[PDB]
Amino acid sequence: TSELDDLALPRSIIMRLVKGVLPEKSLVQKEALKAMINSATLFVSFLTSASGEIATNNNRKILMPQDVLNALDEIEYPEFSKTLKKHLEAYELALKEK
């Protein structure tokens, strides 16, 4: 879609994430990087939708950080939870400071 292309996150930042978990000098071809850039967009939407449901089921209009954390269980990515909780704690800590 032209919609996917319009929404796509920057190719270079995604490339760096990909190469970050691969051995030095591994290559990544165009069709593959593209597929992962587009997959990332669908993941944003996927997690967002599941989080918004939990907000709704809690009769809340604001999609809150705890909704995202609980959505990890619903979309079956609970292995991200410990890392996200660490970010949330640091985020709130920086916020008070800044």
């Binding site: 929404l7 996150l9 920057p10 930042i13 995604i14 760096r16 994430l17 990909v18 978990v21 691969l22 051995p23 000098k25 591994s26 290559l27 990544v28 071809q29 069709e31 593959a32 597929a35 992962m36 587009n38 997959s39 990332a40 967009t41 669908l42 993941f43 944003v44 939407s45 996927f46 997690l47 967002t48 939708s49 989080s51 918004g52 449901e53 907000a55 709704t56 209009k61 604001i62 999609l63 809150m64 950080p65 909704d67 995202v68 954390l69 990890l72 979309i75 079956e76 990515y77 991200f80 890392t83 996200l84 970010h87 949330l88 704690e89 640091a90 985020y91 709130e92 800590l93 920086a94």
Partner: protein, 92 residues
């Protein structure tokens, strides 16, 4: 630290938040996504990319290759339950 071990700053994403929010805003059912929520969604997306790249590389490695090919990414979506939500994008 330069001459020390790598130290991550948590609470930040490498993604451009405006672009992540633009995708978030396409959801018809969401009234408002807070900034803290957007940040967590962004970091989760980083972790997702890493996960997908790792699985795709593992398949490349089994075929004695050093690089990720498109069919590697596709075979990951084809075989792995966690990537079911991508099944339409890859037309499998």
């Amino acid at each position: 630290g330069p001459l020390g071990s790598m130290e991550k700053t948590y609470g930040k994403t490498v993604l451009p938040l405006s672009r992540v929010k633009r995708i978030i805003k396409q959801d018809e059912d969401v009234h408002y996504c807070s900034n803290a929520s957007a940040l967590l969604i962004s970091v989760a997306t980083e972790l997702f990319v890493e996960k997908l790249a790792t699985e795709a590389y593992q398949l490349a490695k089994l075929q004695k290759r050093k690089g990720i090919r498109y069919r590697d990414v596709e075979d990951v979506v084809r075989k792995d339950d966690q990537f079911e939500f991508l099944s339409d994008l890859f037309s499998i």
